């Protein structure tokens, strides 16, 4: 009828790659596709929780603006590379420590990090540094924290030992969101639409799960309007 | 007299001396913010006249340690960074401190 | 003359972009940053790239 609408359902999920996916919502009434797509894009791009590197500790290193023998990259470049690490932490833990020791010439990559089985590395081929000598060795202790949004090192409220290096953390796993509203063939009606959301992420967050968190956030914010009263 | 580079800075607690070494010079790699002491220096000062109210205040509470004055290098305001190098130049004929 | 000791300390500051900073191109087009907009607010194309 006119009063009653049709509620969309998640009808298709497509995983083109580890960092790329498409989610299909169907059916939608006239004009609701754009509304839901824009709302979900704004929520997904702003308020998705994730895990990021926050603190690093390298043996023999006192500050970022320094050098280590047998390493082609400075500590600043190593920290910038560590900023791009994709880590999934098992639920219930908001803080974890991983460890990276490597000796010998070659590219030190993310697949050489030793974890406790509750941490998953989504990009094992991510190059972290390069060791240019057979005598060169690297030993690092990395702190991974769960969070939301972007928290720079300066914004963290203030003892911290000399040698602990703060890293700016971008917790949000979502990189790119696109949405398209197309025609849907449901029963005999033509007015029904279909919403396809293209998500490009770091692989940490599942597409369906992210969709549900965005919907939950939107519903919780709408609850204030559903019960409009002077407070 | 001769000004000395020492960590014994009057009227400064151990909170501000954490980043300083025994010789009074900040460590390399220390995260320092505005107002933090980098090099601790004390300058000899002469006799200073005290107002009668200040004399009564000293009479009640006997604390008085003003042999030297705190003229020390401090981080400029609105400047935050890390110490990456410290260089000490000493005149020939002056004892070298531990740093 | 008269100087006993000198101590020099080098401080490294990472300065990030913020409103008030002057950004320019190679064609004489200078300007001052007015706002650091969120990514969702920024215009985007059909592929979702802002």
Swiss-Prot record, chain A:
Keywords: DNA-directed RNA polymerase, Nucleotidyltransferase, Transcription, Transferase. GO terms for cellular component: cytoplasm; DNA-directed RNA polymerase complex. GO terms for molecular function: DNA binding; DNA-directed RNA polymerase activity; protein dimerization activity. One of its GO terms (biological process) is DNA-templated transcription. Its EC number is 2.7.7.6. Residues 1-229 are annotated as: Alpha N-terminal domain (alpha-NTD). It catalyses: RNA(n) + a ribonucleoside 5'-triphosphate = RNA(n+1) + diphosphate. Coiled coil: none annotated. The keyword Nucleus does not apply. Homodimer. The RNAP catalytic core consists of 2 alpha, 1 beta, 1 beta' and 1 omega subunit. When a sigma factor is associated with the core the holoenzyme is formed, which can initiate transcription. Belongs to the RNA polymerase alpha chain family. This is DNA-directed RNA polymerase subunit alpha. It comes from Vibrio cholerae serotype O1 (strain ATCC 39541 / Classical Ogawa 395 / O395). The gene is rpoA.
Curated annotation (Swiss-Prot), chain B:
The RNAP catalytic core consists of 2 alpha, 1 beta, 1 beta' and 1 omega subunit. When a sigma factor is associated with the core the holoenzyme is formed, which can initiate transcription. Belongs to the RNA polymerase beta chain family. DNA-dependent RNA polymerase catalyzes the transcription of DNA into RNA using the four ribonucleoside triphosphates as substrates. This is DNA-directed RNA polymerase subunit beta. The gene is rpoB. The chain holds residues 846 to 944 of 1341 of the full protein.
């Amino acid at each position: 009828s006119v009063t009653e609408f049709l509620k969309p359902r998640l009808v298709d999920i497509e995983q083109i790659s580890t960092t790329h996916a498409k989610v299909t919502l169907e059916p939608l009434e006239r004009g609701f596709g754009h509304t839901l797509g824009n709302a979900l894009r704004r929520i997904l791009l702003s308020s998705m929780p994730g895990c990021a590197v926050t603190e690093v500790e390298i043996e023999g290193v006192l500050h970022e603006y320094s050098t280590k023998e047998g390493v082609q990259e400075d500590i600043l470049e190593i920290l910038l590379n560590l900023k791009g690490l994709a880590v999934r932490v098992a639920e219930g833990k908001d803080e974890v420590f991983i460890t990276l020791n490597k000796s010998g010439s070659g590219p030190v990559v993310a697949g050489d990090i030793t974890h406790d089985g509750d941490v998953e590395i989504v990009n094992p081929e991510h190059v972290i540094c390069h060791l240019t000598s057979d005598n060169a060795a690297i030993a690092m202790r990395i702190k991974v924290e769960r969070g939301r949004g972007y928290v720079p090192a300066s914004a963290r409220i203030h003892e911290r030992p000399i040698g602990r290096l703060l890293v700016d953390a971008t917790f949000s796993p979502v990189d790119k969101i696109a949405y398209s509203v197309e025609a849907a063939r449901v029963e005999q009606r033509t007015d029904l639409d279909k919403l396809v959301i293209d998500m490009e992420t770091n692989g940490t967050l599942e597409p369906e799960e992210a969709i549900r968190r965005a919907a939950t956030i939107l519903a919780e914010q709408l609850d204030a309007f559903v019960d409009l009263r002077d407070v | 007299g001769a000004e000395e580079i020492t960590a014994d800075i009057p009227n400064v607690g151990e909170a501000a001396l954490s980043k300083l070494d025994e010789s009074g010079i900040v460590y390399i790699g220390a995260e320092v913010k505005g107002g933090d002491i980098l090099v601790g220096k004390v300058t000899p000062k002469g006799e200073t006249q005290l107002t009668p109210e200040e004399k009564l205040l000293r009479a009640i509470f006997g604390e008085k340690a003003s042999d030297v004055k705190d003229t020390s290098l401090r981080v400029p305001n609105s400047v935050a960074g890390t110490v990456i190098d410290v260089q000490v130049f000493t005149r020939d004929g002056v004892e070298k401190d531990k740093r | 003359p008269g100087v006993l000791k000198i101590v020099k300390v080098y401080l490294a500051v990472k300065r990030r972009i913020q409103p008030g900073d002057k950004m320019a191109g190679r064609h004489g087009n200078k300007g001052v940053i007015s706002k650091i907009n969120p990514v969702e607010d920024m215009p985007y194309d059909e592929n979702g790239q802002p």
